[PDB]
């Protein structure tokens, strides 16, 4: 069962440029998720918690709001080395953090959302 707007191949789910504002329902066996070029501003805490085999998430070219709602996503991206190449998300919001990369924001800048 592959999510309606997306395309699937094996355990990979490609939702690249489908104009998504939220996550679709994902198969529990998903190992890779292509979310490049959508309209996501954040993902809810624990969004990938039911995807135990998720190894890779492509998240670039989304309008990320870099506030306290992005705490979970940052923690996911920062946990282990193999996620490093996909980790450099660019903030577009708030205007104070526009153009900044997520990994190098001091807690100071993210806490006070
Ligand atoms: C993505 O957001 C933009 C506004 O910046 C607009 O084109 C539309 O709401 C969304 N795109 C698609 C393809 O749905």
Swiss-Prot record:
Organ and tissue specificity: Expressed in heart and brain.
Disulfide-linked positions: 2-8, 6-15, 66-91, 68-113
Extracellular side: 3-113
Subcellular localization: Membrane
Misc. comment: Platelet activation apparently involves disruption of the macromolecular complex of GP-Ib with the platelet glycoprotein IX (GP-IX) and dissociation of GP-Ib from the actin-binding protein.
Subunit architecture: Two GP-Ib beta are disulfide-linked to one GP-Ib alpha. GP-IX is complexed with the GP-Ib heterodimer via a non covalent linkage. Interacts with TRAF4.
UniProt-recorded name of the protein: Platelet glycoprotein Ib beta chain
Organism: Homo sapiens (Human)
Lineage of source species: Eukaryota, Metazoa, Chordata, Craniata, Vertebrata
Gene: GP1BB
Shown residues in whole-protein numbering: 26 to 141 of 206
């Amino acid at each position: 069962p592959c999510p309606a707007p997306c395309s699937c191949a094996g355990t990979l789910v490609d939702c690249g440029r489908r104009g998504l504002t939220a996550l679709p329902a994902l198969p529990a066996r998903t190992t890779e998720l292509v979310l490049t070029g959508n309209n996501l501003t954040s993902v809810p805490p624990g969004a990938f918690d039911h995807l135990p085999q998720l190894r890779t998430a492509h998240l670039g070219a989304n309008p990320w709001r870099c506030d306290c709602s992005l705490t979970y996503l940052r923690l996911w991206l920062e946990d282990r080395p193999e996620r490093a190449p996909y980790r450099d998300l660019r903030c577009v919001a708030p205007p104070a953090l526009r153009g900044r990369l997520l990994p190098y924001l001091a807690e100071d800048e993210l806490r006070a959302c």
